[PDB]
Scaffold this active site. Structure first.
Site, PDB file in Angstrom:
ATOM      1  N   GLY A  95       0.790  -1.217   0.000  1.00  0.00           N
ATOM      2  CA  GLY A  95       0.000   0.000   0.000  1.00  0.00           C
ATOM      3  C   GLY A  95       0.823   1.268   0.000  1.00  0.00           C
ATOM      4  N   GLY A  97       3.230   2.374  -2.504  1.00  0.00           N
ATOM      5  CA  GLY A  97       3.569   2.969  -3.779  1.00  0.00           C
ATOM      6  C   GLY A  97       4.779   2.349  -4.434  1.00  0.00           C
ATOM      7  CE  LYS A  98       8.289  -2.586  -1.893  1.00  0.00           C
ATOM      8  NZ  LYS A  98       8.447  -3.857  -1.147  1.00  0.00           N
ATOM      9  CB  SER A  99       3.662  -2.174  -7.780  1.00  0.00           C
ATOM     10  OG  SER A  99       4.179  -3.398  -7.295  1.00  0.00           O
ATOM     11  CE1 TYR A 100       2.570   6.919  -8.952  1.00  0.00           C
ATOM     12  CE2 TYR A 100       0.780   5.870 -10.124  1.00  0.00           C
ATOM     13  CZ  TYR A 100       1.504   6.994  -9.812  1.00  0.00           C
ATOM     14  OH  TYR A 100       1.164   8.202 -10.366  1.00  0.00           O
ATOM     15  CG  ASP A 248       9.103  -5.117  -5.895  1.00  0.00           C
ATOM     16  OD1 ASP A 248       8.599  -4.001  -6.145  1.00  0.00           O
ATOM     17  OD2 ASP A 248       8.617  -5.916  -5.067  1.00  0.00           O
ATOM     18  N   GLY A 251       8.260  -7.028   2.276  1.00  0.00           N
ATOM     19  CA  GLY A 251       8.139  -6.277   3.503  1.00  0.00           C
ATOM     20  C   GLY A 251       8.568  -7.064   4.716  1.00  0.00           C
TER      21      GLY A 251
HETATM   22  N1  ANP Z   1       2.335   9.597  -6.439  1.00  0.00           N
HETATM   23  C1  ANP Z   1       1.172   8.961  -6.593  1.00  0.00           C
HETATM   24  N2  ANP Z   1       0.165   9.595  -7.233  1.00  0.00           N
HETATM   25  C2  ANP Z   1      -1.000   8.960  -7.388  1.00  0.00           C
HETATM   26  N3  ANP Z   1      -1.345   7.733  -6.990  1.00  0.00           N
HETATM   27  C3  ANP Z   1      -0.329   7.130  -6.360  1.00  0.00           C
HETATM   28  C4  ANP Z   1       0.928   7.658  -6.123  1.00  0.00           C
HETATM   29  N4  ANP Z   1       1.724   6.747  -5.446  1.00  0.00           N
HETATM   30  C5  ANP Z   1       0.940   5.708  -5.289  1.00  0.00           C
HETATM   31  N5  ANP Z   1      -0.313   5.870  -5.815  1.00  0.00           N
HETATM   32  C6  ANP Z   1      -1.390   4.891  -5.789  1.00  0.00           C
HETATM   33  O1  ANP Z   1      -0.916   3.765  -5.091  1.00  0.00           O
HETATM   34  C7  ANP Z   1      -1.578   2.595  -5.588  1.00  0.00           C
HETATM   35  C8  ANP Z   1      -0.711   1.391  -5.303  1.00  0.00           C
HETATM   36  O2  ANP Z   1      -1.536   0.325  -4.831  1.00  0.00           O
HETATM   37  P1  ANP Z   1      -1.137  -1.163  -5.149  1.00  0.00           P
HETATM   38  O3  ANP Z   1      -1.278  -1.374  -6.607  1.00  0.00           O
HETATM   39  O4  ANP Z   1      -1.918  -2.152  -4.281  1.00  0.00           O
HETATM   40  O5  ANP Z   1       0.373  -1.284  -4.699  1.00  0.00           O
HETATM   41  P2  ANP Z   1       0.777  -2.567  -3.920  1.00  0.00           P
HETATM   42  O6  ANP Z   1       0.732  -3.746  -4.834  1.00  0.00           O
HETATM   43  O7  ANP Z   1      -0.238  -2.782  -2.759  1.00  0.00           O
HETATM   44  N6  ANP Z   1       2.318  -2.392  -3.290  1.00  0.00           N
HETATM   45  P3  ANP Z   1       3.194  -3.827  -3.489  1.00  0.00           P
HETATM   46  O8  ANP Z   1       2.246  -5.072  -3.260  1.00  0.00           O
HETATM   47  O9  ANP Z   1       4.310  -3.866  -2.496  1.00  0.00           O
HETATM   48  O10 ANP Z   1       3.790  -3.889  -4.948  1.00  0.00           O
HETATM   49  C9  ANP Z   1      -1.870   2.876  -7.061  1.00  0.00           C
HETATM   50  O11 ANP Z   1      -3.143   2.357  -7.426  1.00  0.00           O
HETATM   51  C10 ANP Z   1      -1.834   4.412  -7.176  1.00  0.00           C
HETATM   52  O12 ANP Z   1      -3.113   4.941  -7.504  1.00  0.00           O
END
Ligand code: ANP
Ligand code: TA1
Ligand code: GTP
Ligand code: GDP
Ligand code: MG
Lengths: 346, 441, 429
Positions: A95, A97-100, A248, A251
């Site tokens: 949650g 912002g790693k994959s983003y 990557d 946690g």
């Molecule tokens: N700078 C940003 N601007 C806008 N949205 C962001 C930003 N950084 C993160 N996000 C939001 O963060 C969300 C990440 O959620 P998610 O896809 O579940 O990552 P995650 O998979 O939970 N992390 P991980 O499992 O460790 O790879 C995305 O859907 C984006 O909308």
């Protein structure tokens, strides 16, 4: 001689939580990131080499994906063509912002696409017939101190995760025995291969999320550069190789709270032990930067052992920590920040 | 009625427990088989008081205590010894393996699989009580069970029972002496969890008692028995106002109102002054003016800290035996006249007093003398802030190198549980500096 | 009920174990037929750690004897305490190793490890709990070095959360007993640095010196040397099978003595050793043992700690004794000799006490130490290794059994990468 660069990014509030009225917990005065909650008498400060404030679009220090690349990952491709190796770590919690920040979105692309496109579209302006360029690509994972290739298809039988071995070559360095190395011409090939890989990557459901990563995933790009110089005869007399690792990580997974039993607990312990080794190695590289005779504990965890030749010497190492600003996620954000601090304590 | 449950955790807690129950039986007249001959001597009289033992119809007296270890070795000596027919045979051993000096194995890994069974007997013990006061928890910092198991138990007991006194009797770590390389970690992590959940935490150090047994009693080869037998008297003084009669009674819920100003500064000390041999029992008057002064000199503290490097906040004084109150008022006046014994500006009173008529009992085979009067002193100082720094400074070194951390991570912990626990103790150092500041208005 | 499973591989391990059982059975009262003929009640309460019950109140140990040839196995059975071994646990074969690590790790050991794992699985699932394992072997041949290391690699995969001790007998500096000690030792350190939790380095020159100038024996044979190792083994596992005022299991010492996971090579020792004439000229006290246990003429490592520094030490005492003496003496050691100790560990001593001492003494003690001086053992092997590996002297006997040169350099580097992990903690600044 080696320079570690820690950068920390704060995400903005979700749509799911901008209506649920979560309470902001992380702030910044430009340079340093501070963590505060009304209940506490104490507020903790964290100064990093780089902070990427992505919370409010109307900020005078906003950090879009075009900034997290130009400030951190772009100086790593500028160094790969010099003939030296590079590593780029992505740490966070589910949650954050790693994959983003790493891969991105359909129209908002992260570091991998903006790096590969800026690679292939930067050699096509220096690709003479005198100098050439070859790119190969591997993609594996560490799960419970056991290497696994992700670009190999399973079958119709029992366990199809075949464990491989990490050997030490005397001249070059460590390597995995039996790893599929594929050749790439564009970004689309990397996209297809990665999309084929992240479906085999290990994932389990925990209280944090439906799909939490349980493995350290490592994406490699080997770059060869053949130059032809006159030595009074036929000219093939040059080739320098450069390695680009983008990883990557998983946690920490506090096993106290999440009452884990069995493989998750096992997995949890494994990831906790790898993050402890990685941290130590990163903090032993920073002492060398100032200057001191010191010993790096590379052969304490497999990840720090496969990347020995991409972590020390004339090599550049970057680390993107991601943190959530909500008050529900405050023991995770603090652990992330404390883990990033020990990396760079110069 | 006035009731208390004792919980002995780990080797130190259990061995101190043994000492405590050999002393509780003699004051009341209980033989080790649980019987009382006074049942035949005088009819209709309470001597084995219901605060520490439960009665049957057969004239047995079964103690309100629970012993727990994770290894069967120390509690297998209670089943094969003199006091085997006294305790309910549900003495909790989780044999399998112990914590082996790891907080994590006593909290989650091996610490679980036995806590529910511990709380079940703790419910069966309290349901038998017609209104209980609190819990006495005897453990040690530094061991993997005494820290972990206790920190887990303290947190559950904080949900189940809640508004009840949770008093701890702990063996704090010495600055020089030690029997482990991981006492700093196992202390700093216990504090982070047993500070929002404890009500009062009495501390003793083995080095402080060795010097007493040398200087005061002339013993140059002391063991753990000669050490537990003073810890028995200190708990007997606290627990005497519920058992025996006296003029000024002092129950257990009074301490936490007397000695705890703030909810994080609840780490008082202990001392028991008339520690005398049979040869120096004579040549001595043993009056209140001598004893109370002996409770304020550094050479008779049961914790190795110089209180002249700090300021007293509060001090309870629990007298046993032939003691007139005037001899206490004059003694406290003398102690207040002196400039060495220094108090805060926000506590002019700084004295709680309790008196009980029953003198101590001399154990056969002991190094303590028979006394007409005895005294304890449960003080709160800022000098403890000079000990918590030491345990922190040690923590600062090893954790810089991340030594002995693989062993914690390997049993369900994070790297961030140490930083979070070390940052909570840097705040408890700033509070003890705040309380010592001169006030103004 | 903590339980230990005792494997014993090769001539050295088998003789040491045959002497060790002679020692433990004396400690519990068992006779060569398996029958208990003791006097005290504490001998049977915790006898499960090393023995299992039988029909007529007979006690059969958890011995897993291993050898690639039957000559050493036949000697144990045709011996004093050989009728206390289950015959289905003498796992052996023909076609010995030839003082060659390959034959014991790849060719003639791989065809027998699956039969040793059967007895391991049968002696481990018949145990309520399990503190771990312990092996006795030698890093100078092929059976103890090869067929032992592989067993560790295959027990960690099965039982990773359990202990693997190893009472190893390392090579000696001055005079060898095999000409292929360097290779056979480096290739075992390569498999004892990733797969074990406590390794106790024993060397035979130190034991000769003990027998000579501490015990005054002019005919010290190997039984007298193993009589010393059996004493240390007994000492590590005394607080599991007897009571005490301060108890210390295996994991308790491993958690104190191993700061980082790789530096688990220790230097053992035993006190008191009094030489039958100075028995009536010595005091049986704690300081007289503490002075003997910290002297470099009593350790079994052939490595002087005065050329190094202690990172952690342990002291398992046995006897009715005072704790103040132990604490005071172990503080005096650090205070007087701070240069031989590390500054970033405040207290380097772990203490343990047991109340029931060894049958003939009023007090006994046992010593474990992690010193940087251990590098002198390895730094020498890598000096021999590279002197014989530059010329590829005795290698075809290793490549002809299914090995490569790359498996040697691998082992050459790790050892060196271990010395740098010790020399990191050698100088003060
Ligand atoms: N700078 C940003 N601007 C806008 N949205 C962001 C930003 N950084 C993160 N996000 C939001 O963060 C969300 C990440 O959620 P998610 O896809 O579940 O990552 P995650 O998979 O939970 N992390 P991980 O499992 O460790 O790879 C995305 O859907 C984006 O909308
Ligand atoms: C008068 C007296 O005290 O006799 C002693 C004795 O004189 C000395 C020389 C004994 C003697 O030790 C030896 O002779 C010896 C020689 C080579 C190698 C090892 C020992 C003794 O033989 C050894 C023997 O020790 C034991 O019996 C212990 O139980 C020992 N186990 C065995 O010896 C044993 C061996 C095989 C079968 C059965 C028992 C032991 C030690 C440590 C842990 C467990 C067990 C003892 C007390 C003595 C003699 C007999 C003279 C000492 O031995 C030990 C380990 O205690 C050497 O110093 C100690 C104490 C004494 O100085
Ligand atoms: N006064 C006193 N202190 C003791 C006694 N036993 C142990 N200690 C001290 O307690 C600390 C070690 O704790 P233990 O009680 O052995 O530990 P434990 O709780 O059993 O935990 P593990 O054995 O690690 O699982 C050291 O400081 C010892 O000196 C005792 O009988 N009396
Ligand atoms: N202490 C001791 N060492 C031994 C004994 N027998 C052999 N050794 C040592 O073991 C080494 C030889 O190893 P060996 O036992 O022959 O290996 P294996 O043939 O594969 O079992 C040499 O260094 C010897 O010193 C013994 O009975 N006691
Ligand atoms: Mg214990």
């Amino acid at each position: 001689n080696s320079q570690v660069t820690v950068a920390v990014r704060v995400r903005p509030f979700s749509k799911r939580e901008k209506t649920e009225k979560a309470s902001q917990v992380v702030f910044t005065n430009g340079e340093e990131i501070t963590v505060e909650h009304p209940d506490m008498k104490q507020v903790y400060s964290f100064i990093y080499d780089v902070s990427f404030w992505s919370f409010d679009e109307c900020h005078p220090g906003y950090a879009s994906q075009t900034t997290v690349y130009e400030t951190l990952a772009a100086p790593l491709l500028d160094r790969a063509f010099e003939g030296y190796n590079t590593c780029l770590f992505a740490y966070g919690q589910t949650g954050s912002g790693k994959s983003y920040t790493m891969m991105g979105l359909n129209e908002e692309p992260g570091i991998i696409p903006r790096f590969c496109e800026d690679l292939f579209a930067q050699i096509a302006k220096k690709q003479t017939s005198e100098v050439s360029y070859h790119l190969e690509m591997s993609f594996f994972e560490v799960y419970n101190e056991k290497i696994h290739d992700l670009l190999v298809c399973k079958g119709e039988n029992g366990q199809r995760k075949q464990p491989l071995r990490a050997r030490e070559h005397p001249v070059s360095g460590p390597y995995v025995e039996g790893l599929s190395m594929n050749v790439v011409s564009s970004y689309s090939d990397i996209q297809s291969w990665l999309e084929l890989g992240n479906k085999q990557r290990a994932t389990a459901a925990t209280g944090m999320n439906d799909k939490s990563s349980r493995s350290h995933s490592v994406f490699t790009l080997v770059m060869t550069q053949t130059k032809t110089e006159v030595v009074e005869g036929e000219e093939h007399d040059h080739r320098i190789t450069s390695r680009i690792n983008l990883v990557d990580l998983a946690g920490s997974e506090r096993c106290s709270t999440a009452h884990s039993s069995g493989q998750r607990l096992k997995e949890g312990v494994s990831i906790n032990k790898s993050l402890l080794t990685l941290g130590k190695v990163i903090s032993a590289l920073s002492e060398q930067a100032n200057g001191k005779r010191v010993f790096i504990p590379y052969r304490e965890s497999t990840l720090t052992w496969l990347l020995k030749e991409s972590l020390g010497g004339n090599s550049k190492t970057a680390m993107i920590a991601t943190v959530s600003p909500a008050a529900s996620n405050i023991e995770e954000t603090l652990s992330t920040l404390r883990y990033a601090t020990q990396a760079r304590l110069i | 009625m006035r009731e208390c449950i004792s919980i002995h955790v780990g080797q130190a807690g259990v061995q101190i427990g043994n000492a405590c129950w050999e002393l509780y039986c003699l004051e009341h007249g209980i033989q080790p088989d649980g019987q009382m001959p006074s049942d035949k001597t005088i009819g209709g009289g309470d001597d084995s008081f219901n605060t520490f033992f439960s009665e049957t119809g057969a004239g047995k007296h079964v103690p309100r205590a629970v012993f727990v270890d994770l290894e069967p070795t120390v509690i297998d000596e209670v089943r094969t010894g003199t006091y085997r027919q006294l305790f309910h045979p549900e003495q909790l051993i989780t044999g399998k393996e112990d914590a082996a000096n790891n907080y994590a194995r006593g909290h989650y890994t091996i610490g679980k699989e036995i806590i529910d069974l511990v709380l079940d007997r703790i419910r069966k013990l309290a349901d038998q009580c017609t209104g209980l006061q609190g819990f006495l928890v005897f453990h040690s910092f530094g061991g993997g069970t005494g820290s972990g198991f206790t920190s887990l138990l303290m947190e559950r007991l904080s949900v189940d029972y809640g508004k009840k006194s949770k008093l701890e009797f702990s063996i704090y770590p010495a600055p020089q002496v030690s029997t482990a390389v991981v006492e700093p970690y196992n202390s700093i992590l216990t504090t982070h969890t047993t500070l929002e959940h404890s009500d009062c935490a009495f501390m003793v150090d083995n080095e402080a008692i060795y010097d007493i047994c040398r200087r005061n009693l002339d013993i140059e080869r002391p063991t753990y028995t000669n050490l537990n037998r003073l810890i028995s008297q200190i708990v007997s003084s606290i627990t005497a106002s519920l058992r025996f009669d006296g003029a000024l009674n002092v129950d257990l819920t009074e301490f936490q109102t007397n000695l705890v100003p703030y909810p994080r500064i609840h780490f008082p000390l202990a001392t028991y002054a008339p520690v005398i041999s049979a040869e120096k029992a004579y040549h001595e008057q043993l009056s209140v003016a001598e004893i109370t002064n002996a409770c304020f000199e550094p050479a008779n503290q049961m914790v190795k800290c110089d209180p002249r490097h700090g300021k007293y906040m509060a001090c309870c004084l629990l007298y046993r035996g032939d003691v007139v109150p005037k001899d206490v008022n004059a003694a406290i006046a003398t102690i207040k006249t002196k400039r060495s014994i220094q108090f805060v500006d926000w506590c002019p009173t700084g004295f709680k007093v309790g008196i009980n008529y029953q003198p101590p009992t001399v154990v056969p085979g002991g190094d303590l003398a028979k006394v007409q009067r005895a005294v304890c002193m449960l003080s709160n100082t800022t000098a403890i802030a000079e000990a918590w720094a030491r345990l922190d400074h040690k923590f600062d070194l090893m954790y810089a190198k991340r030594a002995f951390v693989h062993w914690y991570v390997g049993e369900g912990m994070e790297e961030g549980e140490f930083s979070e626990a070390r940052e909570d103790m840097a705040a408890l150092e700033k509070d003890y500096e705040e309380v010592g500041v001169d006030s103004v208005e | 009920m903590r339980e230990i499973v005792h494997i014993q591989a090769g001539q050295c391990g088998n003789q040491i174990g045959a002497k060790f059982w002679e020692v433990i059975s004396d400690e519990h009262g068992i006779d060569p037929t398996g029958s208990y003929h003791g006097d005290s009640d504490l001998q049977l309460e915790r006898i499960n750690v090393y023995y299992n019950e039988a029909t007529g109140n007979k006690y059969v140990p958890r011995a897993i004897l291993v050898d690639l040839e039957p000559g050493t196995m036949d000697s144990v059975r045709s011996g004093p305490f050989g009728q206390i071994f289950r015959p289905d646990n003498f796992v052996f074969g023909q076609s010995g190793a030839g003082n060659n690590w390959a034959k014991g790790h790849y060719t003639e050991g791989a065809e027998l490890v699956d039969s040793v794992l059967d007895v391991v699985r049968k002696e481990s699932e018949s145990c309520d709990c399990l503190q771990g394992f312990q092996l006795t072997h030698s890093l100078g041949g092929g059976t103890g070095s090869g067929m032992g290391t592989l067993l560790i690699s295959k027990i960690r995969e099965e039982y990773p959360d359990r202990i693997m001790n190893t009472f190893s007998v390392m090579p000696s500096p001055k005079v060898s007993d095999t000409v292929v000690e360097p290779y056979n030792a480096t290739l075992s350190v390569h498999q004892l640095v990733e797969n074990t939790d406590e390794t106790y380095c024993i060397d035979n020159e130190a034991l000769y010196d003990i027998c000579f100038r501490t015990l005054k024996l002019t005919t010290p044979t190997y039984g007298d040397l193993n009589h010393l190792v059996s004493a240390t083994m007994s000492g590590v596992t005394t607080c599991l099978r007897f009571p005490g005022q301060l108890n210390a299991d295996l994991r308790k010492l491993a958690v104190n003595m191993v700061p980082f996971p790789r530096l688990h090579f220790f230097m053992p020792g035993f006190a008191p050793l009094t030489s039958r004439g100075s028995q009536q000229y010595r005091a049986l006290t704690v300081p007289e043992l503490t002075q003997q246990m910290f002297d470099s003429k009593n350790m079994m490592a052939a490595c002087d700690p005065r050329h190094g520094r202690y990172l952690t030490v342990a002291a398992i005492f046995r006897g009715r004794m005072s704790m103040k003496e132990v604490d005071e003496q172990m503080l005096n050691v650090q205070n007087k000799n701070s240069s031989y100790f590390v500054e970033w560990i405040p207290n380097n001593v772990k203490t343990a006490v047991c109340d029931i001492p060894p049958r003939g003494l009023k007090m006994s003690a046992t010593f474990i130490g992690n010193s940087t001086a251990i590098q002198e053992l390895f730094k020498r092997i890598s000096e021999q290794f590279t002197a014989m590996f530059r010329r590829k002297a005795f290698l075809h006997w290793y490549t002809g059994e299914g090995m490569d040169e790359m498996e040697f350099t691998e082992a050459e580097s790790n050892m060196n990468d271990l010395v740098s992990e010790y020399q990191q903690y050698q100088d003060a600044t």
